[PDB]
Design a protein around this ligand. Structure first.
Ligand SMILES: [Zn+2]
Ligand SMILES: [Zn+2]
Ligand SMILES: [Zn+2]
Ligand SMILES: [Zn+2]
Lengths: 65, 65
């Protein structure tokens, strides 16, 4: 691997959390036992459904693979 | 929306060109039958040794895989 970043926009998908998880935008618990929020398939950001429109679309992460 | 890109700096490595190939910087032939120049391991840019010093470091490509 080299110094490198992946840069794009988020790719959020409905996610079923198996452990208590917080929103990476607002900090409140992702309530529920299933489909509690959205996780970006690329960078892993977790958000409430209602917080999706509050977050910037920019999605970047360092690639070490 | 946006494309996803892999971004960093070039990673040039000496390459054996099997067909006549030109420098992507200056346009002159990569002279010889072996080790004629360097190919960026990330984006594929081909350069003369001397042109390595002349190109911008910026290395980007769209990731379609
Ligand atoms: Zn993301
Ligand atoms: Zn939230
Ligand atoms: Zn490159
Ligand atoms: Zn050249």
């Amino acid at each position: 691997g080299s110094r490198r970043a992946s840069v794009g926009s988020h790719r959020f998908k409905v996610y079923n959390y198996m452990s208590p998880t917080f929103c990476d935008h607002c900090g409140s618990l992702l309530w529920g036992l299933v489909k509690q929020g959205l996780k970006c398939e690329d960078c892993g950001m977790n958000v409430h459904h209602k917080c999706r429109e509050k977050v910037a679309n920019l999605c970047e992460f360092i690639v070490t693979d």
